[model samples]
Target: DNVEEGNHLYNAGKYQEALTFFMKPDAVNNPATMNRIGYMYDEGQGVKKDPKEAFKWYKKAADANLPVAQFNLGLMYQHGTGVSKDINESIKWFRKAAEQNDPDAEMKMGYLTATGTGVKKDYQEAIQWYQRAAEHGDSAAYAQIGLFYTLGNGVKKDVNRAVQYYIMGAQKGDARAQAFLGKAYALGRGIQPDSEKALYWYKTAARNGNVNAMKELGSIYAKGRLGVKPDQQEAQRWNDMARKAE
Candidate 1:
């Protein structure tokens, strides 16, 4: 009930007060609470510094399938952080997180496959893993796949294919991809020219947090080129947004 207050106090470094609210009436039962308690135990904040104790609490938090907690446990096991190193255990926990569709977990799994780290060296397998992550709507996964095509890693070197990959990413709401796709529309590079498509994707990317896209959005409106009349108000709004977000 008082977790919000605890959050404010904890963020403010008032660990003593934060601890008082956190332990009230059994907030410890929550995975969210358990994970933070594990953090505290690890760092000696509001608790004795005990790495083993940290590991235990984190594991309990993972029993709830908190993907974040599970991911942390995997990292701990993988790197011997607060626990004995065990690559097998790390993959187990990573797999648990992957099952929950955590894109980072998928990326890790893909990386392991590609690097032959605790797994067979199979670039195709890695590609499959990243594709799964991309399908899940993760932007990094999209950018990653585009990288492979761009650099000819594990696949043919083809910027044409790279463009196509970004298009898929753009359709999946990847902001970078949207901006790149928008650029393709604006410049008639790799795709057909359609100002409507350009504007849609530029605005889409800007709203999705791509600063470059925000800048492009501002210019298109300001210059009034590529289809519409200049709208100073819209241009200023997008430019201001880019500035603020940056």
Candidate 2:
């Protein structure tokens, strides 16, 4: 299919080739193709960055009930990309995509409800959305659930449960979750304090792009705590990287 071919080209960074395939008369009618075109325009790939053009293509596909298009349209509305910012309109489209089990849309809904953005703050409802996304194997949702557990928001605080969720999310390669799990082990929250485990998790998270973990590792190495030998060079290296990341 043209759409699949276009997707391959797009994935290969051949934006011009992908756009050529997407612009074909027959492909233009495809929701996926239209969404890809909108993305290219929105991102200034092989064409000028034009939010208006992106909106036009996204709206066309959204009208056809394409979940991805609906999600993109919601983002555009939320950020005032091409049209005026409208939280309600964003929520409306997000809900439509979320109803179709779009994991990103579900996470967006969870965030909006949790923060009372365009809707009343409802931790329980946010948890429901997060749970739905988690079922779809979204690691962020697992981390969110862990946060809820730790904070006692919508559910009773349970450090053990929070640690469990953090572990689950960390195993799934979520940097945030890895950092949280490191903290849990370091503090003996819900589990025995194991500096080795904490160090391991922190290093993993830092490697995975968690700035906080890098900072933590810098501090840990500088102080020589947790039975680890102090290494000023190692500490300076992590601190430098952390600063650069910031």
Candidate 3:
């Protein structure tokens, strides 16, 4: 009951009140409540931001095999927020979370393997991790897989396959994937050149807060690409917006 009340309070922006409920004896030992308390401390919601306090609660929950807490602990260790930066420790925690089918942890494992952080670079392993995350409906993972295909990292180069993944991610509202699709359309990569599709995708991505897409839109308007007439005012407006975003 305290945990439920704490969650209700937290969701209503009553962070300080939520902390009191979360500290109740019945809630104190609850891993979910502990993770929420850790998040509050990490983000300075109810109390002053204190990475050490956040780490303390997260570690406690993680020790109880809470997957989300394990992922948080991994990030804290990776960034040296409360604990010393230790790539191996980060990977260990991430692996534990991933074993529990945590999508974010799986994605982190993919990134770590791809970058060779605390592990040997293995594109195949990275792809495997990314695929696992993607299976959980992570749009970003789809985009990452698209990139792997484009670069021929683990599999043979297949621009068409890359485009398919990009389309899937884009359909899921991934701005990065939308931007990639826009560029591919413009350059006639994988698919036939389609300036109209390029402009549409670029505008969609720009509206989604992609700075690169904003820049591309500006250039397109300035050069009168896609059979559109040059509009200096439009170009300047987009360029200014892109600059502000950066």
TM-score to true structure, per model:
0.60, 0.96, 0.96
Candidate 1 per-residue lDDT, tens place, 1-246, comes to: 677778789999999789888777667677898888888888999877888888998899999999878987898899898899999889999888977987778888888887889887888888888988776667767767776776777888777777788888898778888888888788877578899998998889988899999988888889997788889888899889889986
Q: Write the per-residue lDDT of candidate 2 for residues 93-189, one digit (tens) a residue.
A: 9999999999999999999999998999999999999989898779988989889989998889998999999999999999999999999999998
Could you report the Cα RMSD, in angstroms, for every candidate shown?
6.4, 1.3, 1.1
Q: Model 3, poorest ten-residue lDDT window? A: 225-234
lDDT of 3 by residue, 139-183 (tens): 889889989889988789999999999988888999999999999
Clash-forming residue pairs, model 1: none
Could you tell me the lDDT of residue 117 within candidate 1? 91
Better of 1 and 2 by lDDT: 2
Regions of model 3 farther than 4 Å from truth: none
**Comparing candidate 1 with candidate 2, which one achieves the higher TM-score?**
2
What lDDT, from 0 to 1, does candidate 2 have?
0.92
Residue 214's lDDT in candidate 2: 95
* Model 2 TM-score relative to the real fold: 0.96
Cα displacement (angstroms), candidate 1, residue 105, comes to 1.3
